[PDB]
């Protein structure tokens with residue numbers, strides 16, 4: 020049983036899918052269109068021989084996050100994997116950064132990770148097994164201007180991830196944080212557009228520029244690729260891979 | 275020297291912050307103190323530094339857990355001192371427990387002061403520093419902003435958050451005469467640590483984290499802050515300066 | 525696929541050689557049964573990598589005997605403990621010769637073909653000592669940090685050409701529990717198998733965009 | 749200040765090294781310069797620093813590409829100046845080229861100077877510093893000791909090794925009144941970079957501040973590291989890169 024937050028879109032959907040395909044029962048979560056979401060839940064459950072549940076908890080609130088985990092154990096019988104992926108973005112200079120936006124990014128991008136982890140650990144320890152996979156970002160290791168809340172939160176996730184690993188040292192549980200580079204999800208398309216209109220160029224020229232500025236390989240990372248990474252971390256080969264970061268950024272953090 | 279400059283140091287009524295405010299005052303910087311404790315002892319410290327170093331020293335008891343109070347502290351510093359060259363975001367609290375036993379109220383509190391206050395203070399200071407063409411933002415993080423320790427999930431997450439926030443601050447101000455850096459201390463024997471010293475007694479703990487087996491002093495951190503505030507550090511920005519007796523090398 | 529695991533005669537290199545076998549890759553052993561147990565062309569080249577010529581050779585020696593080169597695993601390396609002042613200049617150059625220079629030679633001989641093919645997976649076996657240090661191991665830690673940095677440059681030089689380069693930084697393996705207690709929080713050694721799977725994973729097409737980085741398999745070593 | 753202390757600065761006949769030796773001299777420390785160049789030009793610099801700062805200044809043209817010469821520089825320093833409090837391993841060289849087009853000659857050269865010299869120089873100084881109860885090894889690494897660039901494999905490789913070596917040096921000396929740290933600078937407009945400028949937009953790619961780092965600033969940094977306020981700063985890197993590594 021694997022619970023993946025914000026798994027109704029982009030990266031989360033990729034990791035949810037890739038885990039289903041490994042025989043794990045999935046608990047979807049996130050927003051968007053209800054009809055399309057049910058179509059995703061049913062599809063995955065019938066495309067792979069596994070139980071797929073949907074819990075639309077709003078992770079911007081601790082209780083709701085812990086609630087998602089307790090109810091996930093109550094309806095699935097157990098929780099093996101917790102992929103804390105749900106996240107949002109907002110760009111502006113520090114002095115123009117709305118407090119409300121700062122609060123929202125910290126509550127979802129960082130605090131949800133704490134609440135989910137805190138509710139999951141008790142079940143994982145008692146069962147002698149556990150896999151906590153936090154979706155941080157290259158921005159959990161380096162920074163970019165105008166993304167203070169995001170960079171702070173992502174760095175927070177990396178830090179919290181390490182603590183989780185140390186508290187669970189050898190108990191059959193491991194906590195890690197994938198740190199993706201650009202992934203052309205809706206979260207990045209909004210920026211591509213912003214860049215496209217900023218320099219009066221077309222949607223595809225801005226995409227290439229935004230990509231070359233940070234990504235050496237000049238190629239976007241994929242949810243499927245990220246799913247493959249999440250699956251590996253879930254594997255037995257990664258039994259001793261804990262409290263670390265795994266960068267899938269095509270050279271972003273190398274230079 | 276820092277004559278003619280104004281430094282605001284949060285949580286400077288004691289510990290690390292007091293050593294930093296003192297070191298800066300000894301360089302001729304005007305100072306704005308902040309923090310809690312005994313009001314009489316705070317006034318003695320405030321008047322004492324002003325007299326000993328011949329600088330102007332004000333006190334502002336803003337409760338840093340409140341965003342608007344943090345921004346108010348910076349703005350009133352500018353209104354009363356005339357400018358703000360150095361912002362030292364040092365105030366912070368701790369709490370130990372397993373992630374599962376970690377009180378939510380404790381999580382929110384650590385984050386609000388240890389991380390959010392750095393944001394609020396920095397946001398308030400930036401506009402003034404950009405206009406001034408000069409600026410030095412010094413965030414007191416910790417070795418825990420680079421590595422972790424069990425039972426300190428909130429603290430480590432916040433500290434790491436500060437490190438990241440510092441890098442973003444540096445990038446948004448790069449080339450404008452402003453730098454942003456995070457000093458990351460190792461063990462420093464102050465009230466925040468003597469409390470953990472006594473705790474372990476009911477059950478020389480440097481061997482664990484600090485390879486040199488020596489404590490870092492408020493004075494040494496004050497000297498590091500004075501260095502980052504100097505002109506030789508004009509191109510030192512968006513980075514961490516570890517003062518941890520080897521903590522992070524191994 | 526064709527993978528050249530150096531120092532794969534024993535320990536970690538063996539584990540990596542083994543795992544790449546199970547995935548259907550033609551192993552090109554090295555160092556000082558599997559061909560049948562896995563159904564692959566397993567060769568042996570005892571070329572001593574402590575010589576840039578031997579290394580640059582061991583590579584091309586596979587481009588002709590295997591006809592192809594897809595995966596290069598620079599694993600071979602030695603260790604010597606001694607204070608910096610008491611550290612033999614002989615050993616220093618030895619540790620740097622193999623542990624670091626061999627990677628640059630092997631990599632220098634591999635890239636030309638990988639770029640031609642349009643596919644490559646350079647996997648260097650560094651160490652936690654490529655990110656952190658320990659007293660009395662100045663040559664190892666230095667070389668390892670060196671590998672780490674070299675790995676990053678190899679990645680930037682091959683970014684977007686279908687070739688990646690990463691560094692696995694293993695923690696305590698087995699080639700006592702008080703030794704673990706001090707560096708490994710999990711208190712459980714890392715196995716060549718796990719390293720094999722990791723190397724396997726890094727070779728996966730899922731790690732296509734994973735380049736110029738390090739994968740710490742240390743049971744928590746670097747986390748604290 | 750640094751009155752009574754002796755500081756050896758490798759490759760200090762010009763550029764960064766000279767700026768560091770000059771800042772240390774200004775604090776009152778006796779200086780041992782090292783490097784190549786014109787005999788009269790070097791003497792002018794040597795005699796000038798000594799006269800201007802009121803300290804003793806020796807010049808040793810030892811070739812640091814040789815392990816014994818490097819160790820000889822240090823012993824000669826202790827022989828002439830009577831002690832060694834500060835060692836700044838700064839001499840270095842550069843060569844750009846693809847890993848495949850990279851001359852093995854250049855690879856081993858860059859490694860012996862940029863990396864082995866730090867080792868040799870440090871081994872020679874430690875016995876003296878441990879006996880003294882005080883020491884400061886200041887290695888001049890680079891932003892490339894933490895991150896990398898294309899076509900500088902040997903350079904990046906060497907710098908990272910220095911960074912790692914610095915950490916071991918610190919652990920092996922922890923608590924003995926000795927610290928070892930590595931300054932990692934970004935672009936400094938000197939010959940090492942002027943040869944690449946030919947081969948305000950060169951900064952634009954790596955240095956956010958769009959301003960070069962100066963030898964004076966690196967010297968001020970070496971001075972801070974040698975001060976007592978830095979007694980507990982050891983085994984770490986100090987980046988002076990205008991934001992290079994922040995992003």
Ligand SMILES: NC(=O)c1ccc[n+]([C@@H]2O[C@H](COP(=O)([O-])OP(=O)(O)OC[C@H]3O[C@@H](n4cnc5c(N)ncnc54)[C@H](O)[C@@H]3O)[C@@H](O)[C@H]2O)c1
Nearest residue numbers: 025027028029030049050077078106156199201202204206
């Ligand atoms: N796209 C990138 O370039 C990229 C790469 C590095 C890391 N990241 C991280 O990847 C993760 C996934 O983002 P993505 O790029 O797939 O974006 P996305 O918008 O496509 O997906 C975000 C998901 O979060 C869910 N979500 C938002 N608010 C929520 C709330 N309050 N409660 C519950 N669910 C909520 C959404 O419904 C959605 O399914 C985020 O944590 C993001 O910061 C993004």
Ligand SMILES: NC(=O)c1ccc[n+]([C@@H]2O[C@H](COP(=O)([O-])OP(=O)(O)OC[C@H]3O[C@@H](n4cnc5c(N)ncnc54)[C@H](O)[C@@H]3O)[C@@H](O)[C@H]2O)c1
Nearest residue numbers: 285287288289290309310337338365366416459461462466
């Ligand atoms: N003590 C150590 O060993 C150590 C290790 C490295 C990093 N740190 C960091 O150093 C900083 C200083 O801590 P310290 O060790 O001097 O502890 P301390 O408790 O002695 O000092 C904390 C200061 O914060 C002020 N403060 C607390 N809450 C406040 C609020 N809401 N509003 C305004 N002021 C408030 C206090 O009045 C006090 O002056 C903290 O950010 C801490 O996390 C400390």
Ligand SMILES: NC(=O)c1ccc[n+]([C@@H]2O[C@H](COP(=O)([O-])OP(=O)(O)OC[C@H]3O[C@@H](n4cnc5c(N)ncnc54)[C@H](O)[C@@H]3O)[C@@H](O)[C@H]2O)c1
Nearest residue numbers: 759761762763764783784811812838839840890933936940
């Ligand atoms: N300038 C930069 O942009 C930059 C970037 C960060 C790091 N670095 C590092 O700074 C240090 C100094 O570089 P610089 O820019 O001042 O260059 P430089 O060439 O101006 O100075 C190098 C000095 O080293 C001496 N030297 C060269 N080979 C020697 C040998 N074999 N033995 C003894 N001395 C020798 C020279 O005589 C010269 O005085 C190097 O270690 C370099 O890697 C420089």
Ligand SMILES: [Mg+2]
Nearest residue numbers: 522524746748
């Ligand atoms: Mg460590």
Ligand SMILES: [Mg+2]
Nearest residue numbers: 274895993995
């Ligand atoms: Mg970088």
